[PDB]
Structure 1
């Protein structure tokens, strides 16, 4: 749905405190996880994950049980955020990371309550397990880097 799997992505500035950036992910991503149409049979509504290295990430579906939505890489206090995403191309589950890719995200205060973050993705295709289909569902209106949809809803 989005431009073909692009290598390093770009950065965007959004109006939000740095604490909000890390807090919003752990606060309740369901607040803006659903854009309009989702390939998932049921729209995600509840979310709960342990933020740590090798942590486990799962979400609750309106009628579906818990499915892994990704994983974690490392939590760095207000300044650097990194997370590994482990998911199946068929939106099923991946008990082990065989070809999972890592994501690098940095959050730093920009000007006033505005925070600027640089998000880059590399070797995401290494998954070659159909993970691209998962991105299509996450890709909502106005396709673009994750910061694009995140900044608009934020």
Structure 2
């Protein structure tokens, strides 16, 4: 994706609320990217009342990790581009996407992202994205499903 269109694909083994909880609140409780303190990895991750991804740096708020357009409870999250305090590219992309959590049996949730405009920036814009984002959030989604897999299936 992210060259023609952006799609997200994640299967959660617990339910949509655990998915939403993990995705937007449980930032500090994963271990793929947030594996830090006052960094990418702090006691927050995202702001609920405004819809904006931030964590608690020692000097204030560490990395902005998204500009949320829609914070629609355990259901849907439309967010925009933002990344880690690393060797990253700036939010020159906007990269917005509709995170669609589909509740299955209320103990499973398949999320699909659908967006097509800023995400299409693949090739050039995605190569500068590759700087540090490629080694974080895509990795997050793996441990996301696994941490959650332990929440009500494995552990």
Q: What is the CA distance between 1:111 and its match in structure 2?
A: 2.6
- Alignment deviations for residues 71-99 of structure 1 (CA, whole Å, 9 cap, x no partner): 212122443221112347855795xx543
Q: Which of the residues 25, 45, 56 maps onto 2:42?
A: 45
Helix, strand or coil at the partner of 1:108: strand
Selected match of 1:15 from 8, 13, 20: 13
CA distance in 2, matches of 1:123, 1:4: 5
TM-score by length of 1: 0.63
Aligned with 2:68: secondary structure? Answer: coil
Q: 1:36 to 1:49 in 2, by over 3 A?
A: closer
Q: How many residues align?
A: 142
Report the counterpart of residue 32 of structure 2 in structure 1. 34
Q: Is the 8 A contact 1:67 1:93 kept in 2?
A: no
Root mean square deviation, CA, Å: 4.0
The match for 1:59 is 55
User: Do the aligned partners of residues 25 and 59 (structure 1) sit closer, same or farther apart at CA in structure 2, a change above 3 Å counting?
Assistant: same
Cα offsets for 1:1-34 (capped at 9, x unmatched): xx99684335232211212222223432111143
Query: With structure 2 as the length reference, what TM-score do the two structures score?
Result: 0.63
Over residues 34-81 of structure 1, what are the superposed CA-to-partner deviations in whole Å (9 max), with x where a residue is unaligned? 36988xxx662332432366x432123579962222221212244322
**Is the Cα–Cα contact under 8 Å of residues 46 and 54 in structure 2 kept in the other structure?**
yes
Q: Does 1:131 find its partner at 2:129?
A: yes
- Secondary structure in 1 aligned to 2:21? helix
Which sections of structure 2, spanning at least 5 residues, go unmatched? 149-155
Give the unaligned 5+ runs of structure 1. Answer: none
Equivalent in 109, 114, 117 of residue 103 of structure 2: 109
Which residue of structure 1 lines up, in the alignment, with residue 151 of structure 2? none
Cα 1:148–1:51 change in 2 (3 A) is: same
Match of 2:82 among 70, 80, 86: 86
